Design a protein around this ligand. Structure first.
Ligand SMILES: Cc1cc2nc3c(=O)[nH]c(=O)nc-3n(C[C@H](O)[C@H](O)[C@H](O)COP(=O)(O)OP(=O)(O)OC[C@H]3O[C@@H](n4cnc5c(N)ncnc54)[C@H](O)[C@@H]3O)c2cc1C
Ligand SMILES: Cc1cc2nc3c(=O)[nH]c(=O)nc-3n(C[C@H](O)[C@H](O)[C@H](O)COP(=O)(O)OP(=O)(O)OC[C@H]3O[C@@H](n4cnc5c(N)ncnc54)[C@H](O)[C@@H]3O)c2cc1C
Lengths: 474, 474
């Protein structure tokens, strides 16, 4: 019938959201401005919680088929350190996979599930009322739906049109990124990079396989125009930072970015929501935007589908803002911390030497990696038990593993007591009755995003907790 | 006969040095510029390694009689945190004692041991040759000795006259200190301080008992003259930082200081040495200068006495620079780290929030406190064994404790094997033959400063190690 949800923007956030909505029959149209997929790959991989999320939906096998697992140092502000031996996840690794391939994989999955991706379609305006949202496209055509989600990136058109304030710290430091060929061998390049880095940690060089290299080099001041830089400006900035320009020539990508950290004041404005870079910006350098955007979509999907299905309780959609807005605030702040630790100044450099001492302690190294990989996220769901609000890691069952049972994106009561029941909610919550499950609690109610809503062994207590995330008994 | 050592400056460094030299019969003259002891107290106490040092020389009882032990939070960059439960010392506390009382106690001890303190005597010039040093005093009188130690503070006359370069980071931030009366009650003062501190961590207020308060408040810019500030400038800086000047009036101390960190390039220039603030400056805010200066004197004393006694091996005096110059470098750097963690800027403030998370880990809290209390100092004495180069904490003996045997300031072989011997060195090294001593090594050779020179059980190995710190067998 009518479109249920329109998603502005077909990046990883919107695509992951499209997939989550299609698990529940939601008619979903992604409006993506560009007529062909973008080929400039941003992130080089995925962290554990994103890896876990893919596995909960059955996508990890294809992700591992298109990537390489590794466990090396340096993921927090570039501080080299052994991989934490006791990270609290069954997916304790980093998945090296270009974001272009991540976007392809999410596009194929969204399409195979029946999301309608429309390329060449730019949202230019919106008009919402009590029953839905009309998106106005740049060619004058109009689309109606029940909800509209702005997943349209850091310069979100939806955010601007809503007037949602974007407070934070403005850009004070700019950085250039170029994918260019060089007139010197690779060995010369990497030797100079290793040397410059001892002074200037913001400089970096990563080969792509085809003789192109990705160069990251500080800009000279801020720019008046905030536009893309020219090859000559790249040479100016390379000369100042490294002494040589390595004969950079024939760019295939020239870009600029700032260290601004901004956070949308409201993730929800009536029937219109924001997710991903549309809801928060922060530097690509030490940022986590790809993971953060995917996990915004993972938080919002089942809740918005519940709204469409008619069973969402009255505060459910608002729990999206209430849970994900604090998470982004902490990512933004921790990324500011990391940028400082990369600074040239003698003060920050002294702090960096201290941090290097501290990361030799396993519980520091574990603390920093669990933070940035997002496995440590805890929503405040108002209970004392430590598990409540955290995502439950994958655990062995009698046969199989917990994440194998989550592919429908529904709720899950993991019950070892042999006694509890979610009858009245079975259409929304499965009953995983397995006393051999390797979890040292009597039972735990898991929301569709894997976050623990409740731990206990009393049926009446279980019943009192169900309506909050799963609505009324039917 | 002739003066053996002249000490320029009668601060805690020079006084502690005077005491260490008098343990060995060294004729010692302290030339102190001021005619009467200074009554402005700087440090408010002593940290564990300084406490340990006093106990090794039998002074702890009088220090504890004039001070209060406490174990609270906040000693590293003001980060509140429980006292580390497993600090690796028998003296695991902080000793609150005004530095004026510390200076009195060290003066009485130096005098009771026969050091000659001469007040009103300002070193103005020096002339050294192959056999000694002549100090020229500001009134034209001249004094000859074998060695001269500049313990004359951060603007050392001896350092300047030697031409020893003082490299480091210059002052970029100034701070005011005032001991003043206020026109508001104490409760009003502390409430405003608690509030301002949430923004500006460099602000502080500490009562003295007599209705005077010590105020620490950022200066406005740098000063052209670098002189003492006026009451009006204090009001200007208080108004800018806290909104009110609390009716400050009738100062009894007005002062300014900068955050410069400088380190003398050579602790020794022929027969002239530097110790304490004469060899290194760094901010009083997060600094450790009182402890650091006392422990410089503790390193130099027995070595300089060995030179006077005629048995010092050829490199012994140079080991003073080689051991204490790296220690000061790390104190200076760690103090820069702490100053950054107190900064107003959003970057440093983000790093501070991270550090607050990390200090909740016991091994972080222990690491930071053991660093600043100096118990973690390890000289590179070229051995693999972890104890070698570290000071040995106080340990129970069969009866009594190790530090009770160190009051002569001589070497000590702690021997549990029942077999070793320092015969040939007995005048310089005592033999503590106690198999019940609570140390899980066969034996350890301790230098007169308590630092472990050697761990083993083989007599021939013990013999090969003695000459390095104790000279030739007699
Ligand atoms: C150089 C670089 C390196 C990075 N490295 C990492 C990393 O290592 N780890 C990490 O976690 N993150 C990293 N990131 C961040 C990550 O790339 C972004 O956070 C991620 O792309 C966010 O996805 P998104 O779907 O929210 O938004 P985007 O990918 O920006 O996509 C939004 C989509 O909206 C479309 N669009 C825009 N306006 C409209 C409109 N009006 N109508 C319709 N469609 C519209 C755009 O065409 C685009 O396809 C990096 C980013 C960069 C630039
Ligand atoms: C406000 C403040 C707070 C501090 N708080 C702490 C703290 O909490 N913890 C800590 O560890 N440290 C602290 N310190 C640092 C500590 O006070 C100094 O490091 C300590 O005084 C160093 O002692 P010193 O003997 O080397 O030098 P100084 O105490 O400076 O003494 C040198 C002496 O030389 C004399 N003199 C100078 N020139 C001559 C000359 N030409 N001839 C003869 N005599 C001369 C001076 O009169 C003086 O008595 C603080 C310092 C200040 C100012």
């Amino acid at each position: 019938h009518m479109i249920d949800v329109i998603i502005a923007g077909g990046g990883p956030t919107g695509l992951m959201l499209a997939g989550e909505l299609r698990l529940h029959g939601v008619r979903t149209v992604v409006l993506e401005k560009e007529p062909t997929p973008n080929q400039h790959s941003r992130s080089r991989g995925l962290h554990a919680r994103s890896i876990e999320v893919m596995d909960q939906r059955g996508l990890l096998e294809r992700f591992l088929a298109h990537g390489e697992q590794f466990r090396v140092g340096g993921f927090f502000a570039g501080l080299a350190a052994e991989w934490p031996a006791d990270l609290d996840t069954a997916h304790s690794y980093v998945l090296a996979i270009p974001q272009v391939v991540t976007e392809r994989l999410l596009t194929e999955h969204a399409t195979e599930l029946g999301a309608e991706i429309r390329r060449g379609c730019e949202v230019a305006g919106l008009d919402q009322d009590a029953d839905g949202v009309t998106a106005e496209l740049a060619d004058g055509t109009r689309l109606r739906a029940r909800y509209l989600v702005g997943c349209d990136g850091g310069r979100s058109t939806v955010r601007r049109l809503l007037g949602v304030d974007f407070p934070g710290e403005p850009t004070r430091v700019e950085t250039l990124l170029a994918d260019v060929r060089i007139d010197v061998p690779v060995e010369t390049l990497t030797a100079v990079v290793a040397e410059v880095r001892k002074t200037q940690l913001r400089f970096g060089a990563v080969p792509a396989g085809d003789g192109f290299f990705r160069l990251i080099v500080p800009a000279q001041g801020l720019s008046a125009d905030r536009a893309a830089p020219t090859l000559d400006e790249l040479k100016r900035c390379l000369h100042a930072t490294a002494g040589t320009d390595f004969g950079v020539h024939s760019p295939r990508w020239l870009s600029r970015f700032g260290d601004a950290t901004r956070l949308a004041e409201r993730y929800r404005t009536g029937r219109v929501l924001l997710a991903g870079d549309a809801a928060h910006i922060h530097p690509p350098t030490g940022g986590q935007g790809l993971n953060l955007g995917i996990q915004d979509a993972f938080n919002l999907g089942w809740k918005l589908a519940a709204a469409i299905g008619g069973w969402a309780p009255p505060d459910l959609l608002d729990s999206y803002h209430d849970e994900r807005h604090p998470v982004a605030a902490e990512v933004l702040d921790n990324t500011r911390a990391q940028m400082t630790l990369l600074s040239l100044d003698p003060g920050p450099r002294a702090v960096r030497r201290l941090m290097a001492e501290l990361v030799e302690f396993p519980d520091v190294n574990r603390h920093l990696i669990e933070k940035i990989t997002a496995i440590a996220v805890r929503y405040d769901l108002g209970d004392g038990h430590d598990l409540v609000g955290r995502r439950l890691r994958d655990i062995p069952l009698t046969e199989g593993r917990l994440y194998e049972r989550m592919r429908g994106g529904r709720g899950l009561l993991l019950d070892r007591t042999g006694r509890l029941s979610v009858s009245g909610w079975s259409d929304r919550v499965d009953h995983l009755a397995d006393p051999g499950a390797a979890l040292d609690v009597p039972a735990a109610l898991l929301r569709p995003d894997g976050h623990v809503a409740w731990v206990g062994e009393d049926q009446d207590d279980l019943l009192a907790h169900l309506p909050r995330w799963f609505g009324a008994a039917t």
